[PDB]
Amino acid sequence: SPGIWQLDCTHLEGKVILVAVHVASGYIEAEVIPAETGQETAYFLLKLAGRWPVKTVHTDNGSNFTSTTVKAACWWAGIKQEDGIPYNPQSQGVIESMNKELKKIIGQVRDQAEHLKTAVQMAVFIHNHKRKGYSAGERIVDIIATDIQ
Amino acid sequence: SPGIWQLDCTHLEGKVILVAVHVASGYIEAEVIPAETGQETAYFLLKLAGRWPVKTVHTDNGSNFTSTTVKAACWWAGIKQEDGIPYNPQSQGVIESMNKELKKIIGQVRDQAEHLKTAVQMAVFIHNHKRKGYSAGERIVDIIATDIQ
């Protein structure tokens, strides 16, 4: 559980926002990309796994699950690549709610930057720091530290 | 201490590698950029502070310290922007050594990717996971978790 992440792809302004969610905490990293290719996804996972102890990634769709470039990145970074089938139906709902919340935050900041990428990084910051009371940033560190110990 | 980071800029292949080091742990994030502008530095700090609890950043040079774009990003993200004067002379040595280590690792992986950015992210992964016995990734999580509790 401390090492489980889920990929999520959402769309805004004719661009793609790729999101990785740490399942147990709700902490996220995200990036804007032109389109969701195997290479973009592979590079994103490489970045993520260099920054956090990524044991398993539930991929966001079958194309990323199939992609040999994505499999190659997961091999390189020691990540177990898995499907993202919502065996628990609550998973779809959680992802959908997160995309809605993220788009809400982007709207709230959208006028503070010219470029969508900047707004998305502001949204990451706000999401990770929001207290609901601990924040997702606090939760992820505590979960992982407990695991190390 | 748990919230203090240091910026560092090094050069390779006619490109700039911008690095943020978590001082207490030696954990790093890095990106390749064409040149080290206020806007590039500002965007990098925005990303960093959305991901880790960044209290203070020692800037890497006077241009980044002066930059109103960098100051604005620090304001946005709640970061105390500071100079990077090595009042402890051991600081220059530590940075120099880290740049040498990073370039060594990049050399070791350089043939595994076409693009420097890929090699740099591989280098981040190797550096953060290397056991020195705990890794820098373990140390940062432990330091921050201890602070939270």
Ligand SMILES: C=CC[N@H+](Cc1ccccc1C(=O)NCc1ccc(OC)cc1)Cc1ccc2c(c1C(=O)O)OC[C@H](CCC(=O)O)O2
């Ligand atoms: C078909 C893939 C292309 N190469 C093949 C290659 C070219 C030359 C030498 C070795 C290889 C090789 O297969 N090594 C094993 C490997 C596989 C996956 C992997 O994924 C992390 C990293 C490494 C690897 C690569 C992937 C994603 C990238 C890259 C690059 C690159 O070559 O640098 O460059 C930046 C780009 C940014 C995102 C975007 O622009 O889409 O993401």
Ligand SMILES: C=CC[N@H+](Cc1ccccc1C(=O)NCc1ccc(OC)cc1)Cc1ccc2c(c1C(=O)O)OC[C@H](CCC(=O)O)O2
């Ligand atoms: C003179 C700066 C340009 N704007 C001014 C702007 C334009 C329109 C509306 C508001 C503003 C405004 O001042 N808001 C307050 C503010 C200041 C600093 C800040 O720092 C994170 C974020 C927000 C902000 C900006 C900075 C770095 C970027 C950006 C953008 C952007 O406008 O989206 O876009 C991507 C780029 C990527 C790295 C690269 O390509 O160099 O980094």
